[PDB]
PDB file of C-alpha atoms (C1' of nucleotides) in Angstrom:
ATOM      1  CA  UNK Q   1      -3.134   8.928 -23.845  1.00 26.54           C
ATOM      2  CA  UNK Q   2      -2.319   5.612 -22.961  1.00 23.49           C
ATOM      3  CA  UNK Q   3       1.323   5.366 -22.640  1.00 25.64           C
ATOM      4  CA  UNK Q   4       1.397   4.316 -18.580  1.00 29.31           C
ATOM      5  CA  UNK Q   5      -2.293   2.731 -18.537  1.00 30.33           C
ATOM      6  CA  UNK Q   6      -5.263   4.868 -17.518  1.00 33.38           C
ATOM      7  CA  UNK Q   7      -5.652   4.541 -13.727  1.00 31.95           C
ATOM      8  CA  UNK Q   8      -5.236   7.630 -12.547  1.00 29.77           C
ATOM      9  CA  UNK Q   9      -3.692   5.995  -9.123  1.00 29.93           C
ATOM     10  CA  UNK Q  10      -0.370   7.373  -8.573  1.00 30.55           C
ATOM     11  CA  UNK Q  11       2.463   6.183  -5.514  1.00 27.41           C
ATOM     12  CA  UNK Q  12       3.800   8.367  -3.149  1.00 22.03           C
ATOM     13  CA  UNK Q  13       7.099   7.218  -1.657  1.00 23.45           C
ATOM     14  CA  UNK Q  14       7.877   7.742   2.157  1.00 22.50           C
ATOM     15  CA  UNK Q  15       5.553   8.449   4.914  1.00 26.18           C
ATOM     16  CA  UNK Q  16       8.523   7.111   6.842  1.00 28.12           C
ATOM     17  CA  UNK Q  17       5.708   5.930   9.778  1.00 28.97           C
ATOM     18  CA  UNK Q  18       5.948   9.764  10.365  1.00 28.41           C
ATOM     19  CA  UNK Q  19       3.371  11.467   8.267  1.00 25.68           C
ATOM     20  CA  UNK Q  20      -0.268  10.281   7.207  1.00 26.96           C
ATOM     21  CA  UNK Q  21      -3.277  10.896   5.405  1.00 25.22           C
ATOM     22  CA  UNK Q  22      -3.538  14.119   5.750  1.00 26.08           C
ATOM     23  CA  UNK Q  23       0.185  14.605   3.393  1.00 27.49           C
ATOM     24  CA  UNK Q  24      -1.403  12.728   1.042  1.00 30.10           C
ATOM     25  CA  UNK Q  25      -4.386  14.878   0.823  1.00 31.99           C
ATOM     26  CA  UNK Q  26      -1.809  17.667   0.769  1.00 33.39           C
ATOM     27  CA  UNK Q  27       1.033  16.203  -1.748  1.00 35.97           C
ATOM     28  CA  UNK Q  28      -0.976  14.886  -3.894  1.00 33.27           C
ATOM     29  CA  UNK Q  29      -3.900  17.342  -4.205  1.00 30.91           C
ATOM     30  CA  UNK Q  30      -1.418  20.346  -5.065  1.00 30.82           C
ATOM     31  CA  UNK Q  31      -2.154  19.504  -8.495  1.00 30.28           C
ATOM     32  CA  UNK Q  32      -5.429  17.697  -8.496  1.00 30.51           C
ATOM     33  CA  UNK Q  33      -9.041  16.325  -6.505  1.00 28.61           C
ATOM     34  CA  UNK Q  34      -8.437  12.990  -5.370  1.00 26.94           C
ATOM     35  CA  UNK Q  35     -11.576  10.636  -4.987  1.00 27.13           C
ATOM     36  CA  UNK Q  36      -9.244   7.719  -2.863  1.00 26.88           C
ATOM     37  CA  UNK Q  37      -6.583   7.449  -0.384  1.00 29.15           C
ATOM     38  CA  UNK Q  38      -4.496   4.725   0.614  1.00 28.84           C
ATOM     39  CA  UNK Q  39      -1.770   3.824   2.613  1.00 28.86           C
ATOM     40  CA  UNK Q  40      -0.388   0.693   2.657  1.00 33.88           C
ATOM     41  CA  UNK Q  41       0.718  -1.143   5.901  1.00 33.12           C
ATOM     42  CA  UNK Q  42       0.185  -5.770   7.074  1.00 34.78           C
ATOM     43  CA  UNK Q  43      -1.587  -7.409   9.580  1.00 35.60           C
ATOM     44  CA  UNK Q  44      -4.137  -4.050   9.094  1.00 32.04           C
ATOM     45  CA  UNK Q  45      -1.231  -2.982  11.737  1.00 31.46           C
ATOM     46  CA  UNK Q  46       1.747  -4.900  11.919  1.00 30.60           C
ATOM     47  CA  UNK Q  47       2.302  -1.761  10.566  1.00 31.22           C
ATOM     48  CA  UNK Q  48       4.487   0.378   7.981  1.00 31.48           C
ATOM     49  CA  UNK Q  49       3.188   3.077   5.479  1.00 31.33           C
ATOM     50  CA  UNK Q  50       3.351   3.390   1.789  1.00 34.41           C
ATOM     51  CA  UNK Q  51       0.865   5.634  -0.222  1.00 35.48           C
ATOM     52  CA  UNK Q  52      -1.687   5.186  -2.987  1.00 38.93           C
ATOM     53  CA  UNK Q  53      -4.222   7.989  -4.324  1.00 36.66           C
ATOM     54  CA  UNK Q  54      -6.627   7.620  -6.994  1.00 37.29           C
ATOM     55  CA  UNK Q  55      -7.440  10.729  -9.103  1.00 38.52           C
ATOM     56  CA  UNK Q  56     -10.823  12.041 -10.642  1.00 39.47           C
ATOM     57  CA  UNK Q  57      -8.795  11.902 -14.224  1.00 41.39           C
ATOM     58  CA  UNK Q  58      -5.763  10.629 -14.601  1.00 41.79           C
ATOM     59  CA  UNK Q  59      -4.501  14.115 -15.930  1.00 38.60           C
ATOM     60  CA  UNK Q  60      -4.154  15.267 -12.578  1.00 36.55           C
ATOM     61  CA  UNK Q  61      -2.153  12.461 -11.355  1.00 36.32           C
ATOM     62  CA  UNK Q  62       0.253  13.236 -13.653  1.00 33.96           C
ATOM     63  CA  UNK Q  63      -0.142  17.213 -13.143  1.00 32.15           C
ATOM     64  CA  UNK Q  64      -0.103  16.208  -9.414  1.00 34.15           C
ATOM     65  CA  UNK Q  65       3.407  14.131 -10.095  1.00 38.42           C
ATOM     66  CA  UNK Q  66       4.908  16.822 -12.352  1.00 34.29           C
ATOM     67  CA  UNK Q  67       4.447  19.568  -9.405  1.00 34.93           C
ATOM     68  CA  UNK Q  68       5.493  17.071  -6.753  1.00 32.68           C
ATOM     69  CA  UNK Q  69       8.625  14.719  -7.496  1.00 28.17           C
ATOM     70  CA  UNK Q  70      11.169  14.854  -5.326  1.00 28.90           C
ATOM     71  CA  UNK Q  71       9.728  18.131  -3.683  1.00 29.15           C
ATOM     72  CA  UNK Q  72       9.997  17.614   0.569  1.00 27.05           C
ATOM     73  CA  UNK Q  73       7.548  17.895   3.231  1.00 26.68           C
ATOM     74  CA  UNK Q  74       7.678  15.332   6.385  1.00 24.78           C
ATOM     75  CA  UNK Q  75      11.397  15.791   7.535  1.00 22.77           C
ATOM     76  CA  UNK Q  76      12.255  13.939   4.497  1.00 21.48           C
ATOM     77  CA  UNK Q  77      11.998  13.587   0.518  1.00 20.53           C
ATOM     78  CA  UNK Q  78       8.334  12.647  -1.439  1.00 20.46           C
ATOM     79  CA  UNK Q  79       8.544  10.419  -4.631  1.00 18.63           C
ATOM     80  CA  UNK Q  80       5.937  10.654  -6.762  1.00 24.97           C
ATOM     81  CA  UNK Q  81       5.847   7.741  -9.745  1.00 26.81           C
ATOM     82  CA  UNK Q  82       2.439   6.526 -11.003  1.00 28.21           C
ATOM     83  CA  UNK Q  83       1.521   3.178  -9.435  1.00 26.20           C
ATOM     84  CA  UNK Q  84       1.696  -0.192 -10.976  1.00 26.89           C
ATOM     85  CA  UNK Q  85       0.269  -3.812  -9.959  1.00 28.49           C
ATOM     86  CA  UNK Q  86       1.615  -5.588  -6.633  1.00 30.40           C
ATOM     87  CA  UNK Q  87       2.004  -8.310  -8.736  1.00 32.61           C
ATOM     88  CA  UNK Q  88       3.166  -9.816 -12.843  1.00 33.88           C
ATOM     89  CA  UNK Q  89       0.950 -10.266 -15.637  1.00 30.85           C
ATOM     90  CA  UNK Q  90       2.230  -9.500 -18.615  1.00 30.75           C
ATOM     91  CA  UNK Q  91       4.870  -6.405 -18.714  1.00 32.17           C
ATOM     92  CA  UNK Q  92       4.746  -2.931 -18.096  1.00 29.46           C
ATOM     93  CA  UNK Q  93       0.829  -3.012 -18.421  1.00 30.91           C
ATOM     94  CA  UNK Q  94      -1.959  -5.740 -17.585  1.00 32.16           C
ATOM     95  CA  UNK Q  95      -2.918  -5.938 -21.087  1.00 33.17           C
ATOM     96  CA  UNK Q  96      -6.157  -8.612 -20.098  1.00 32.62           C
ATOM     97  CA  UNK Q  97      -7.175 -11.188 -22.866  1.00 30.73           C
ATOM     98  CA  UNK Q  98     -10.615 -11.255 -24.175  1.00 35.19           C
ATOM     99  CA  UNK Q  99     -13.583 -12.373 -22.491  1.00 34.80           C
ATOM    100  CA  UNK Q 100     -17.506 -12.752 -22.010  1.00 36.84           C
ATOM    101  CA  UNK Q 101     -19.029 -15.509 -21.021  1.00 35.52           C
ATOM    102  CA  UNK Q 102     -16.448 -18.242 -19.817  1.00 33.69           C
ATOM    103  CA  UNK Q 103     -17.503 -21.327 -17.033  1.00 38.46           C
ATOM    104  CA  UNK Q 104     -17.946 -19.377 -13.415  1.00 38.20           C
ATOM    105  CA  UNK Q 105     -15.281 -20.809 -10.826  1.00 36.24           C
ATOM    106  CA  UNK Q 106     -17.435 -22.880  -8.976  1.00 35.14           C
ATOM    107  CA  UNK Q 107     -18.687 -26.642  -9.488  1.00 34.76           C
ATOM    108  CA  UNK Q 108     -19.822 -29.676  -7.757  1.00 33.67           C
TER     109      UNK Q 108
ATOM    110  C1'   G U   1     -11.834 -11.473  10.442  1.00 33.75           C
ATOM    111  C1'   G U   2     -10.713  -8.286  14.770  1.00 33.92           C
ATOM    112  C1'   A U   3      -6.964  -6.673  18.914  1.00 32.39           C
ATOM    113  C1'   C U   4      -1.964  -7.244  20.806  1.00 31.91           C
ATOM    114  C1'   U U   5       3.157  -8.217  21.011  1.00 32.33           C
ATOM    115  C1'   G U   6       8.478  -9.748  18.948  1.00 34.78           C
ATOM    116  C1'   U U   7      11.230  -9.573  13.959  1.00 34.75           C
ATOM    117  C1'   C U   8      13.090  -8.478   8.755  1.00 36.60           C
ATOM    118  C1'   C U   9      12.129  -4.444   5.946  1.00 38.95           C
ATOM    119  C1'   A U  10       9.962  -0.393   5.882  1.00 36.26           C
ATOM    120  C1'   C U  11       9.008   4.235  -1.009  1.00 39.85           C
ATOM    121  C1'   A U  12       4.216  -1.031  -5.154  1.00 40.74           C
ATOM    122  C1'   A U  13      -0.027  -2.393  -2.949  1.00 40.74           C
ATOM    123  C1'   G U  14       4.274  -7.197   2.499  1.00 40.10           C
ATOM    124  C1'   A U  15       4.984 -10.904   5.261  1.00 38.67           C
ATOM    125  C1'   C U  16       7.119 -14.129   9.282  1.00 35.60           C
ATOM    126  C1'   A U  17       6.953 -15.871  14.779  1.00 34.62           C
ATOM    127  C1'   G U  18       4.065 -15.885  19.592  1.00 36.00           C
ATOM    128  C1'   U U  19      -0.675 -14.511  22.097  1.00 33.29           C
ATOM    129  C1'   C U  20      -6.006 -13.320  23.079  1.00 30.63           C
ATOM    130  C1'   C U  21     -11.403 -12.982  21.007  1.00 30.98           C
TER     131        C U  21
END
RNA sequence: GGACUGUCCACAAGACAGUCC
Protein backbone atom coordinates (compact mmCIF):
# COMPACT_ATOMS: atom_id res chain seq x y z
CA UNK A 1 0.00 0.00 0.00
CA UNK A 2 1.08 3.15 -1.17
CA UNK A 3 -1.86 5.28 -1.64
CA UNK A 4 -0.81 8.22 1.15
CA UNK A 5 3.14 7.52 0.95
CA UNK A 6 4.77 5.15 3.43
CA UNK A 7 5.83 7.22 6.46
CA UNK A 8 4.12 5.95 9.02
CA UNK A 9 4.12 9.67 10.73
CA UNK A 10 0.67 10.65 11.37
CA UNK A 11 -0.71 14.51 12.80
CA UNK A 12 -2.58 14.94 15.71
CA UNK A 13 -4.61 18.15 15.78
CA UNK A 14 -4.97 20.23 19.10
CA UNK A 15 -2.93 20.09 22.14
CA UNK A 16 -4.52 23.51 22.53
CA UNK A 17 -1.09 24.52 24.81
CA UNK A 18 -3.11 22.33 27.30
CA UNK A 19 -2.06 18.77 26.90
CA UNK A 20 1.48 17.22 25.99
CA UNK A 21 3.48 14.35 25.32
CA UNK A 22 2.16 12.20 27.38
CA UNK A 23 -1.62 12.43 25.06
CA UNK A 24 0.32 11.67 22.37
CA UNK A 25 1.77 8.61 23.84
CA UNK A 26 -1.82 7.94 24.85
CA UNK A 27 -3.90 8.98 21.51
CA UNK A 28 -1.84 7.74 19.36
CA UNK A 29 -0.61 4.45 20.90
CA UNK A 30 -4.35 3.15 21.38
CA UNK A 31 -3.81 1.52 18.21
CA UNK A 32 -0.11 1.15 17.79
CA UNK A 33 3.95 1.39 19.31
CA UNK A 34 5.26 4.58 18.37
CA UNK A 35 9.17 4.85 17.95
CA UNK A 36 8.94 9.14 17.77
CA UNK A 37 7.16 11.97 19.23
CA UNK A 38 6.88 15.39 18.26
CA UNK A 39 5.29 18.43 18.98
CA UNK A 40 5.67 21.27 17.12
CA UNK A 41 6.12 24.82 18.65
CA UNK A 42 9.04 28.36 17.24
CA UNK A 43 11.74 29.96 18.73
CA UNK A 44 12.18 26.15 20.55
CA UNK A 45 9.56 28.27 22.83
CA UNK A 46 7.99 31.14 21.46
CA UNK A 47 5.76 28.54 21.92
CA UNK A 48 2.45 26.75 20.56
CA UNK A 49 1.85 22.92 20.14
CA UNK A 50 1.00 20.79 17.22
CA UNK A 51 1.72 16.95 17.16
CA UNK A 52 3.71 14.52 15.05
CA UNK A 53 4.29 10.63 15.86
CA UNK A 54 6.14 8.27 13.85
CA UNK A 55 4.98 4.60 13.90
CA UNK A 56 6.99 1.21 13.89
CA UNK A 57 4.79 0.37 10.50
CA UNK A 58 2.78 2.53 9.01
CA UNK A 59 -0.23 0.05 9.56
CA UNK A 60 -0.60 1.24 12.90
CA UNK A 61 -0.74 4.80 12.08
CA UNK A 62 -3.52 4.21 10.19
CA UNK A 63 -5.09 1.57 12.80
CA UNK A 64 -4.07 4.28 15.35
CA UNK A 65 -6.14 7.06 13.09
CA UNK A 66 -9.09 4.74 12.41
CA UNK A 67 -9.63 4.22 16.39
CA UNK A 68 -8.89 7.87 17.08
CA UNK A 69 -10.51 10.62 14.69
CA UNK A 70 -12.43 12.95 16.14
CA UNK A 71 -12.58 10.88 19.49
CA UNK A 72 -11.92 13.66 22.70
CA UNK A 73 -9.57 13.70 25.46
CA UNK A 74 -7.94 17.22 26.69
CA UNK A 75 -11.18 19.35 27.27
CA UNK A 76 -11.45 19.40 23.62
CA UNK A 77 -11.64 17.37 20.17
CA UNK A 78 -8.33 15.16 18.66
CA UNK A 79 -7.88 15.07 14.79
CA UNK A 80 -6.08 12.48 13.58
CA UNK A 81 -5.00 12.82 9.56
CA UNK A 82 -1.67 11.30 8.44
CA UNK A 83 1.01 13.99 8.10
CA UNK A 84 2.30 15.55 5.00
CA UNK A 85 5.47 17.88 4.15
CA UNK A 86 5.70 21.55 5.73
CA UNK A 87 6.40 22.47 2.47
CA UNK A 88 5.55 21.85 -1.93
CA UNK A 89 7.25 19.57 -4.12
CA UNK A 90 5.34 18.07 -6.39
CA UNK A 91 1.53 17.19 -5.26
CA UNK A 92 0.00 15.08 -2.87
CA UNK A 93 3.34 13.04 -2.54
CA UNK A 94 7.20 13.99 -2.84
CA UNK A 95 7.60 11.77 -5.69
CA UNK A 96 11.85 12.54 -5.76
CA UNK A 97 13.59 12.31 -9.26
CA UNK A 98 16.37 9.97 -9.81
CA UNK A 99 19.71 10.18 -8.51
CA UNK A 100 23.33 8.78 -7.67
CA UNK A 101 26.15 10.45 -8.06
CA UNK A 102 25.47 14.24 -8.95
CA UNK A 103 28.32 17.33 -8.12
CA UNK A 104 28.27 17.73 -4.00
CA UNK A 105 27.08 21.41 -3.06
CA UNK A 106 30.23 22.77 -2.28
CA UNK A 107 33.09 24.46 -4.50
CA UNK A 108 35.82 26.91 -4.50
C1' G B 1 22.65 28.18 18.98
C1' G B 2 20.75 28.88 24.08
C1' A B 3 17.36 31.85 27.76
C1' C B 4 13.65 35.72 28.19
C1' U B 5 9.78 39.01 26.99
C1' G B 6 5.68 41.55 23.58
C1' U B 7 2.50 40.09 19.08
C1' C B 8 -0.40 37.45 15.04
C1' C B 9 -2.00 32.70 15.02
C1' A B 10 -2.17 28.83 17.49
C1' C B 11 -4.67 21.48 14.41
C1' A B 12 1.43 20.50 8.96
C1' A B 13 6.06 20.54 10.76
C1' G B 14 5.57 28.88 12.00
C1' A B 15 7.22 33.25 12.20
C1' C B 16 7.59 38.67 13.45
C1' A B 17 9.41 42.75 17.11
C1' G B 18 12.60 43.93 21.57
C1' U B 19 16.34 42.02 25.17
C1' C B 20 20.46 39.12 27.50
C1' C B 21 24.60 35.12 26.86
Amino acid sequence: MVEADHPGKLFIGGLNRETNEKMLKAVFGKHGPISEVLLIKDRTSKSRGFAFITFENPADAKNAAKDMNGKSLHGKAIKVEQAKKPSFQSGGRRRPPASSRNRSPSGS
